[PDB]
Symmetry: C5
């Protein structure tokens, strides 16, 4: 009984040219694309790339594959894929894309009586995501994903998303788990580009990323905040204890310097100032300013001791207030 | 005499279509899966992936391979594997799976008279293991391993473990050796998933991991514990030695700060607090608090020396008791 | 109707030898090359290599492919590419070049009635860019890209850019985005080389790179500048405070030493002095010189206190002026 | 004249089934294995793997290859290897094995009149070497290398070393050069294993490794030894110099702490104590104990100065003696 | 007209056995090898390997390829290479060699009427270069490159360099550019080796490398030299300033300790002392010795102040002289 299916396959392959698209010189081929993101890979700020794994699916029409039989569907595998025509889809921004092979090549091929074809493929894309780290770490990123035909212009092959946007792109709940980002949502789009070879249709999908704060708070912000508090303790000490107050100022200044170097080692080498850098610089001024205050006080502690005492007492109140006020402005500005 | 076997192989291949599963349109194919873990690979917390090497085996039925001969078994190699039908099994969570080739492709194919087939394969799977580092390092992890068909729905191919759970999955004694984890045990499971293409059967296996403590004790906990003890020595010193007591407080505070930075460099960049972080913070307060005590004492050592002496004497007893009490609560809470 | 195209393809392949170039022993083949840079990859100073992704296109003439039909163009794919003759172009300086495969091999093949052929290919080139870091970081680099034939001498195959230089090489606006470089412009060139096998034609394209400053200012220059200012504070302190002034000098000298080590860790291991190194050395002298001044002052503070006071007062003015003057000369020299 | 050899090859291939082993269902095939280690690769303690390059050779018997001709030997290449039957040998513990291809596949195939076959292959094996770092760095390791058949049980194929053990395994003098290990010698062995598929024969070869000390002496031991000596200098100083003696104790304690962290960064993350760790801990006690002695002395220098002087004088002698005695016990225990 | 060439190719392939070398059982094949180094890759001391890219060329004789035609040369490509016999050359010391593919396999095949064949190939070799770092960094290295036949003994195939040594090996001027080495020159050689399979001919080429100093001077030597000078400043200070002189000695000793650790991190883990290590040790003694001098002086400053002053004055002169004298001996010894 199974032999009937074998005859059908041979008939379709008879007089079949895999090098010619269906409806050549007669109409325009239409392709429907749907995507499912199995898991969203890590985002590397240093390399400006993000990995992703998807089940890419493409649907089109082919009159040459019409067949008649008891079954309306013919599940198959990659064996027959190489014997027919498939679109030459590729990713413009994909630096390096590799497929999955074991245990068996992850591909499917389904054919119906009307000729409709469903071809699906599993891929891993190491695309590139340009970013503007001006409000880092309070930054929102829009990592795109562009793909389209390579050799078939817009006058022969057209890519259109199937059904609505939500059905076109699906993201698994467990996949959207990044250590330092939130997957707020997804969007889709289309456009045309004109080149020497002709016009092409481009399908674009964007993923909205919102960085989650909390790692940098425990790593960079808190050490800077506590370092400033340490310096202010020198004010409460007596003036005559020159050595004691000197240690506080010198050690704190060096501590701030090394934090800036270590903090930016992980951050990408960007030739502009970030929000974190401004925060570090302000904290650097406080510790440095406190050291200057001690030097000025110790330089006039003999001629006019009266003014020195007033300055030292005043500093115990002025400096904490300014630091507290600055934090409210800084956090409010970037968090609202 | 050997020529008899050659004729048998040709007969089976005659009229054989590798693109059609056995019993198509007549019944539902059943596949029995058994696994053996040669060695459990390292677990990378930063990349949330774990490597594993297994001898994957699949058994099914094929009536087209029936044969009659003196021998009930026909040991073979990968040469005949490509000439017949095999399931398109794949791992849903496998980021990158590669097979082993040298010296000869590690595959076997055995056929019996009844048509039963035993196909085995050697694989290395770089799967992903999501984790919740809320009780780190006292954390228990459940790294899964999911696999199933790609193109054949649940109505055509069904995966069922053979015999009991213990026989289905076997782990070598030498393989279960990880530098920073314990392989407490294994479990298996099954479930169905409905998608656009149809329903599929999913076979799930979980490995229980219990982190072994002792590396972090020698790396993070002890330096923090000894640092606190160092600070308390300042209390036993005389008040007039302002410079001496200052060095203890300043150096210890900086030492704690760098330990936090270095400790989390190896730990994954997670935007939430761990148990280790709370322990570090508490130890940071003690050293910082001791420095504040000295400043307060030195600020009133002239007007009311009587109260200063009482505070210094009391601090020698209060602080050690609190630190000792805290450790009992902390360790007891997470170890019981 | 489509069957007409199938017959045409078979006719061209009849009596076609892919191992023989067109017009063998009759004339000289001419090839026109055009390039489009999709994205300019990162530049690794340590490895002296730069990555790049391009759409390489080659045009030539083949009389054997003449055909007559309703359509003047025959869009195709990589399937027919292997069945005809293509040039053996290669990159002389390309350390490791790999192509892109998924989803379908990124190649196109177009044929016209006259025999003109348009073959395009997508490549990623990890070429090598020698550099002279004598004015680092104020350095301008000229990273080339050389390619040509491997087996066909200049007497058989000649490479010539099509149209003008601007049309020959095109760089996408978004692609020319490097974290630490500016793509000032592009240039092209040609030349011949004589070897044992014979003369060959070499096509050379150069990319002008101008390093963008600002990362090193926040990383190396500022810490050195602030460190010098810290040392000068010791002058304003009193001579009798021997311990206080000692701490400033000792700590600052060590701080400068570690900055030099850390700064050059990222920089390539080059056995010659850079502009940054000279700046560090000068700053090292100031902090070291200040320490020497204190030692000299403290060594004569008993016999002739009168001269010691004059030296200390003078140092408060001389040193800042010299440091300010040096910066103007240094920055002006390399920035103009 | 050469045409005679061509006819011989065709005759052997006639009626040859590469899927059936020689003497099937008649006897048991016997295979002789010999190995030559071109170079022993680096040993990675962190990854518990060792690389090795060998010229694997296998000899067996095949009656179907009998031939008659003037020459008793037929040197050949990999071209004929794929056309005959070869054993499916594989390495059980080989995580990832890759062969060498350029310039030409490194394989040989020699056939004699009697049917004896000599098949050799070049391989690189990234095997795994479990270790017990309890006596680190004075540890001796036994890295094995296991290989055997995959599909052919012990009842069909048997592996036996040829000639004696010394001839079976050969190691080049230049190859046995490791930066931090000594190749004391080699050993071989055999055993059987019973599994579901049946019994198999396992050939095991062990390499004895003796770690060479001297890198850790210059890296970890000496800094700890010199640090202890530095602390003892504080004893010779006067009691009234509270600040001076404080610096020695505080700085040394911190120095020991960082050495422990840095030392174990290269060492694998093992959750148990090593010999080096105990040595560090003992040295940590000395520096810490010296600081405690100063605090105790300074705490009674007023009420009973007489006892303080005796303690300080005694400490100058007791501490050096204990440190010297400890080293003799420690080194003698692990070196003998 | 071109059809004549097509007929010639078919005639040569007729009755051609690619598995049999020319002149089998009649004479000894002779192969001429010439090399051109496009670029000399980086040398990794840690991994004891060096990368290199070459255009390997081999010339031999084949009577079966004789042809008659108007053209004395037949330029071709890799298409015909697989259809004839080529030597199985390989590199004995090549850990991992890979070829270049894009755009087209970099291979050429030229045939003359007499049968002479010119086969060339482009390769990248990651060979191993053992080194003896006893005089590091003033060390001269001899990195070899060995290659020869795999299956053809010395009685069948012999490798001989063509023309003189200079013509045999050619190095491009731009290629011989290493960041930390000088390519002084090249040499060639030959030898025979006897093994179980028989005698073989080995072709050896050595590259002379002379390390260029200047990176270590700016990285390791200068910080050590300046650190010693810093310690000597303590001598010029007054004895009563116990705290001041203590800081100089303690900080400098720790600074030297960390330089040794950091310096050897990049250096390979070798279990023996280098020249740099001895220089560091000597500098360590000076700073340590100066600290001992202060302790001895402060220990007798009460009983016999007269002798203390003489020691302090003398130390200001003795120590600088010894350090200067040592440098002359050290540099002269290794630089001459
Ligand atoms: C992600 C959007 C990228 C857009 C806008 O920035 N780039 C362009 O504007 C553009 C792209 C290609 C091009 O042609 C290069 C070429 C091709 C060729 C091949 C296949 C395809 C599909 N397109 C072109 N064949 O030869 C040559 C030479 N010219 C301009
Ligand atoms: C590890 C459990 C993962 C579960 C639950 O989280 N994911 C889903 O719920 C799910 C999976 C696939 C899917 O379809 C995508 C698809 C397929 C296709 C191909 C092969 C297979 C076997 N399944 C689907 N072909 O085209 C498209 C488009 N939709 C939803
Ligand atoms: C980027 C410019 C590089 C220039 C200038 O520095 N190099 C040379 O001057 C040069 C290059 C090759 C050569 O021949 C080596 C050779 C070849 C062979 C193969 C294919 C081609 C295309 N050329 C040569 N076949 O065998 C052997 C031996 N000799 C000198
Ligand atoms: C290095 C020594 C390792 C020893 C002792 O620790 N391991 C075992 O005891 C062991 C090994 C395999 C096994 O079977 C798994 C299997 C196989 C299969 C395939 C090929 C071969 C050659 N053996 C088994 N085919 O399907 C399944 C399922 N069971 C137990
Ligand atoms: C770079 C110089 C290396 C020299 C000197 O140190 N080594 C030796 O002395 C030596 C090399 C091979 C050998 O044989 C191993 C072997 C081979 C085989 C295959 C192909 C070739 C060309 N040679 C041998 N086939 O099976 C087996 C077993 N024995 C000793
Ligand atoms: C792209 O081209 C198609 C041609 O049919 C056209 O319908 C569509 O509107 C174009 N899109 C844009 C954004 O211009
Ligand atoms: C999955 O589907 C099969 C269909 O036969 C059914 O027997 C089984 O109970 C289902 N499993 C679950 C968990 O629903
Ligand atoms: C290279 O050779 C060609 C041969 O036609 C010649 O026309 C051209 O001028 C040569 N180029 C140079 C730079 O010599
Ligand atoms: C392994 O099996 C073979 C079967 O012939 C037997 O001769 C041999 O003694 C066995 N080895 C061991 C260690 O039991
Ligand atoms: C190597 O063998 C050949 C055999 O012809 C011989 O001529 C040559 O002298 C030998 N070389 C050495 C170094 O012995």
């Amino acid at each position: 009984n199974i032999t009937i299916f074998t005859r059908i396959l041979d008939g379709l392959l008879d007089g079949y040219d895999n090098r010619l698209r269906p409806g050549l010189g007669e109409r325009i081929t239409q392709v429907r694309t749907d995507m499912y993101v199995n898991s969203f890979g890590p985002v590397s700020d240093t390399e400006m790339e993000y990995t992703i794994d998807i089940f890419f699916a493409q649907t089109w029409k082919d009159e040459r594959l019409r067949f008649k039989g008891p079954m309306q569907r013919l599940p198959l595998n990659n064996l027959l894929a190489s014997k027919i025509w498939t679109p030459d889809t590729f990713f413009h921004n994909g630096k390096k894309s590799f497929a999955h092979w074991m245990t068996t090549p992850n591909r499917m091929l389904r054919i119906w009586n009307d000729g409709r074809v469903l071809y699906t493929l599993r891929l891993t894309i190491s695309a590139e995501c340009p970013m503007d780290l001006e409000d880092f770490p309070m930054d929102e990123q829009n990592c795109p994903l562009k793909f389209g035909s390579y050799a078939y212009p817009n006058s022969e092959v057209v890519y259109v998303w199937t059904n609505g946007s939500t059905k076109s792109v699906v993201v698994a709940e467990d996949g959207s788990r990044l250590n330092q980002y939130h997957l707020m949502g997804q969007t889709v789009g289309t456009e045309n580009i004109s080149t020497s070879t002709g016009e092409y249709t481009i399908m674009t999908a964007h993923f909205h990323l919102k960085r989650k704060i909390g790692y940098f708070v425990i790593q960079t912000y808190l050490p800077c905040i506590m370092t400033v508090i340490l310096s202010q303790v020198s004010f409460w000490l007596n003036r005559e204890s020159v050595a004691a107050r000197t240690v506080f100022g010198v050690t704190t200044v060096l501590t701030m310097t090394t934090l800036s170097i270590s903090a930016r080692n992980s951050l990408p080498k960007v030739a502009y100032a970030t929000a974190m850098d401004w925060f570090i610089a302000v904290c650097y001024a406080f510790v440095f300013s406190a050291l200057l205050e001690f030097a000025f006080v110790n330089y006039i502690t003999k001629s006019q001791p009266a003014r020195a005492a007033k300055i030292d007492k005043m500093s115990r109140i002025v400096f904490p207030i300014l630091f507290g006020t600055f934090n409210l402005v800084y956090w409010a500005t970037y968090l609202n």
